[PDB]
């Protein structure tokens, strides 16, 4: 079981592999962490112990992978100037294929029927991709006055449209930036 | 990488394992999966190479798992109507599914969706259904199934002698057979999509 800290090095040196095709030095992972190099050989040291990484300098490679493993978050609020407060209740290990490279992810449980004529059902788990624009008829999480939907989303000049996928349901309209984007939708992922 | 007759048996090792608190032999594996006793020793002698077994000083009661395979699940590219067999299965690659999505004590495939046929259980074209492997369905499952030679993806009902075979898609028609025609490759558990 990782701590937080040593999660956040992990993903810190799988992300630094993806994108520079080497591992980073030890003053690499001092800097950003804004510890001493010491500290940082110390989470190594750790890694190394519990089985998630293999170690001259840049000896280093990943022995169990926690990129994939995404946050499965639940509720989210509103806070200072509007920043997503996340509530996160689990990692779900998503299948490569499925997911971005340059991306980060989240996943989301469907409440309602609001997206059921995009085949998306109360339940299931879509995989957001992290970005703060949207194209119109890109289905996104959103959120505005303090409320979490997913939708297509519609900008004409300063209005944007949250569109149900439900003929049942109505479309709502807002001031631009009253509506923050968390992230475009994906992936879908149903257990029956 | 795998064989499905070595990731098989590596399910076997651990189901065993788990059940049994010891590992089963060479012939134990052998006779499970109707392969020689050589063979099987083969297997472990790879398996080992490759890093999913430990067998400490090559001993058979040291067999232990070192890499679970139990979320690597096979997509199966083809299955085709056989003569020997009602159905032959070509494998296409491995897919990693949390096992959250699996059930314990089984199998599991995935197929990728052709066409409309499920789309009012929201199932489309283009995403992939994990498959339970089971020869049984109840009414209301969604299945894949074997009939004529061909494989479909339906909602599965049994009246006495004769099985519906009915598309989640108003525009396309039901297929009613003699019950024992129909071949259930397992039942539809889960739904990947990509967008």
Same mark, same amino acid.
């Given at each position: 079981?990782?701590?937080?800290?040593?999660?956040?090095?992990?993903?810190?040196?799988?992300?630094?592999?993806?994108?520079?095709?080497?591992?980073?030095?030890?003053?690499?992972?001092?800097?950003?962490?804004?510890?001493?190099?010491?500290? #940082?050989?110390?989470?190594?040291? #750790?890694?190394?112990?519990?089985?998630?990484?293999?170690?001259?300098?840049?000896?280093?490679?990943?022995?169990?992978?926690?990129?994939?493993?995404?946050?499965?978050?639940? *509720?989210?609020?509103?806070?200072?100037?509007?920043?997503?407060?996340?509530?996160?209740?689990?990692?779900?290990?998503?299948?490569?294929?499925?997911?971005?490279?340059?991306?980060?992810?989240?996943?989301?449980?469907?409440?309602?029927?609001?997206?059921?004529?995009?085949?998306?059902?109360?339940?299931?788990?879509?995989?957001?991709?992290?970005?703060?624009?949207?194209?119109?008829?890109?289905?996104?999480?959103?959120?505005?006055?303090?409320?979490?939907?997913?939708?297509?989303?519609?900008?004409?000049?300063?209005?944007? *449209?949250?569109?149900?996928?439900?003929? *049942?349901?109505?479309?709502?309209?807002?001031? #631009?930036?009253?509506?923050?984007?968390?992230?475009?939708?994906?992936?879908?992922?149903?257990?029956?």
């Amino acid at each position: 079981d990782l701590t937080e800290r040593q999660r956040k090095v992990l993903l810190f040196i799988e992300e630094f592999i993806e994108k520079n095709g080497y591992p980073p030095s030890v003053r690499e992972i001092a800097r950003r962490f804004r510890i001493t190099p010491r500290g #940082a050989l110390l989470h190594l040291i #750790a890694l190394e112990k519990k089985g998630y990484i293999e170690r001259k300098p840049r000896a280093l490679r990943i022995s169990k992978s926690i990129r994939n493993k995404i946050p499965l978050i639940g *509720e989210i609020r509103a806070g200072e100037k509007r920043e997503a407060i996340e509530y996160l209740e689990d990692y779900i290990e998503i299948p490569e294929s499925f997911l971005s490279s340059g991306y980060d992810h989240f996943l989301l449980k469907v409440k309602g029927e609001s997206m059921i004529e995009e085949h998306i059902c109360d339940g299931d788990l879509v995989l957001v991709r992290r970005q703060d624009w949207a194209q119109n008829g890109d289905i996104v999480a959103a959120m505005v006055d303090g409320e979490v939907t997913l939708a297509k989303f519609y900008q004409r000049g300063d209005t944007v *449209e949250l569109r149900p996928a439900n003929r *049942e349901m109505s479309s709502m309209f807002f001031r #631009a930036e009253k509506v923050k984007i968390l992230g475009k939708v994906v992936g879908v992922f149903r257990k029956l």
